Amino acid sequence: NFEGKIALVTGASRGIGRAIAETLAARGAKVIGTATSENGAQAISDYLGANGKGLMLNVTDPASIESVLEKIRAEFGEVDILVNNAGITRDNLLMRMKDEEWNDIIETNLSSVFRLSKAVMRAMMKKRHGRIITIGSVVGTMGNGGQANFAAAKAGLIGFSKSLAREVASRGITVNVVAPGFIETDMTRALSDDQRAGILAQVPAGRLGGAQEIANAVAFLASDEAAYITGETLHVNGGMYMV
Amino acid sequence: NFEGKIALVTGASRGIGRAIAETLAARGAKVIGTATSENGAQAISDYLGANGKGLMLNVTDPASIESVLEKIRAEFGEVDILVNNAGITRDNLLMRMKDEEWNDIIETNLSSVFRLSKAVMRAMMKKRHGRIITIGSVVGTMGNGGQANFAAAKAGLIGFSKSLAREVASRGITVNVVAPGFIETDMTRALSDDQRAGILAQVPAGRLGGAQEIANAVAFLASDEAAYITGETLHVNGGMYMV
């Protein structure tokens, strides 16, 4: 139960992001989901209704980051739960990877984690309680051909979280990572029927995971039932990989 | 909420074992906790009340295993959730470790996992649904001086679970491990303040974990909210170790 808790879920327009936003809201938290346009920010506001609000945010723009937080402190208050789910992909074999494809992935997938975590830390420490959860990926752990940039960022955010976790552990703040395997979303519904089959062959469970399933893991970690879990990575991949 | 689910929690006399038994019961499951003595069984039966029953079980005795399950199928039904929490410790530096101290730890901490998991598998596969959760230990992952035997068994049960997970993943059955760090028990409660400070010194969180906190992790994994998590190890150690 997250009654009275304020959660900021970056990139909450669809799939995992949205399921996270809706699940936290359904369990009592005032949720602020974000998108990169006024349109998307509105759509989020529409589905969250009176439970939260949608705000436009660019996780790579320091200005956008403080601006968004300011509003939040004004209309709702200090952020208690941060869920870093904003991220993108710029797949390509190393040989064909453009410098911009590397830099954007790093800036958006990794650096974003540092900026936002840093931006909500002070308030959490004062209250001596908080939750920071970043949506990683099984790729950050096993790596994947054609995704060296994506993998670097996903692996990197775990290294980041482990270190931050050690800095604020005693202050009642946990920093964890939920690593999804293949989840049914846009990026999987737009794959040919053959690619889809190729994907399922790697998953012992024999089915793609659900966005909601990733949301359930986040909610658990964001709750008070997971206060002794920090610096940990929770893999939700149907057995695709086991650590 | 495990409405209509039957859970068998081995070694449910106290601490982690008991908290697991009570938490599953509080959330709607009919729980069967076990002990080595008729006393314990009865004590377990008293605290579980109408939610479950206590039965005497020796996880190293094939006969006892058969027998206990038999009594469960007769009075309650097929086991849906298995929680392997029975285990012991026979600490000693390798050079002073007795052969019996190695064999007992292996028989009770590792082999037990094979015997019980195997014993509840068929019914689970038929129902095309099930949960197997073993209580490991952070020691299984980082190892520990004077606990080579304990460490072998805890590390070993993860290897076991990973393999079993791959065998029954497609059948709607997950096999996971929850690895506790230092948890407040009767052993630690009776330690001197200096001894306790030497343990706390290792935990970034700055406190021992709570038996209930381990119970919460198990409940999450045992629920339908964790259907896409299998072959995974969930570390609940306050940051003592991060993988």
Add this chain to the structure above:
Amino acid sequence: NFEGKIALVTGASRGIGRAIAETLAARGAKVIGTATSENGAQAISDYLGANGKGLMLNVTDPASIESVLEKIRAEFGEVDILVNNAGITRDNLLMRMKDEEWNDIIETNLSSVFRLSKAVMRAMMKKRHGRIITIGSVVGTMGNGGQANFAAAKAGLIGFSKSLAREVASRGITVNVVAPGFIETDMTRALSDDQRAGILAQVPAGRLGGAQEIANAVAFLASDEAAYITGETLHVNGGMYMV
């Protein structure tokens, strides 16, 4: 260069075991390879020639273990390098796994590591120098359907080594594990041309590893060039798995 060093390589009749025995011998060590029969022990003596000797050993028989070591101390001296490579497989889905198939794998693959390591420890500690290397398997880390017993033992020996490593680290003794992926041996040359292809599909390198390649890793770890490596697991699997 292992001039003046004595190495005991268990199960050195073929493949990995033999390549290890020959490589250590070629680099100056007096090698004692073992087998389960007088015949095999002789064959080993024949290929090692003046570099070592073959002895009959049963890693599950405490009597055989001290008996073999005694001779070694009599004809060569104290063991400086221990390479646990003896091991077997009793594959079967959990449902069809016989109690004897579980017990034998554990006794031969895991318990053996404890008995032999314990048996050569005293001398190593006195000399304040030594090397203990156990041949694990990628299966101990990722697990594998139909090999729950094998996986438990391989995972378990890592837990064991980590703990032992912590006990003797300061005494100039390292305890490590080399985890091979699919290696060309009898157990792979006796697979149908289809199973072989299935195996290669999992290996980025696109070829089975060589017994000699596993031997090279062991030699490195057994040398003085790896004195700061302990409690570590070296994966040699062509990219089949990455940790």
Add this chain to the structure above:
Amino acid sequence: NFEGKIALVTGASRGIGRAIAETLAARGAKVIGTATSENGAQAISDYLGANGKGLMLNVTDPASIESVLEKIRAEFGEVDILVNNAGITRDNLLMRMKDEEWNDIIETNLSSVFRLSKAVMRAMMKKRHGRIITIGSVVGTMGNGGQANFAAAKAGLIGFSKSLAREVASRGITVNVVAPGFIETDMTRALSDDQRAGILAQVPAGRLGGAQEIANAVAFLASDEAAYITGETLHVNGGMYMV
């Protein structure tokens, strides 16, 4: 023995970098060590003598990267072995970490790995053989208070290497990481005995590691004796951490 092999070791002015440069050179490779200043290049050239040359390089400057490689193809030839050892530290608790301290660490410690690996790939793929080794850190795996930026980059380069490894594995090219623990450098040599005791307290081996010891691990991985090792991380930390 790298007879006829060309190795490029970034940041080879001292410690680990230098030991790597000298060890590869001593074993027959023509080595090109790099520094940020013309001084360093020359100093490197002096100690390498006729075995190699020193060149000024800035791993964050695409121009410098191009340029340096250009000079190497002209005077020596295509790079066969790449050792990414250039890196820096900008320690600080998250709340006091400057944006420049995050960006510089990422640009220099992580992005550099992408730029240089990409820059030597084509020739390696053509030769259907190559070695890429990056010097990580135990911090990338366990994280560390006050080093969130360093940790992110070190963890990130592993994710990168794993993915690249999968892309070029079949082409006879391995991509690995050597993760040193506490290594005796000019920073530690100048610490007070109490500060040194606080580090030694963490190392089971009971001493700092030697720069040469890290060099030995790299040489092993760079040799033909490690052709079946890729996407792997080799921990050389005296037991400070065990994975």
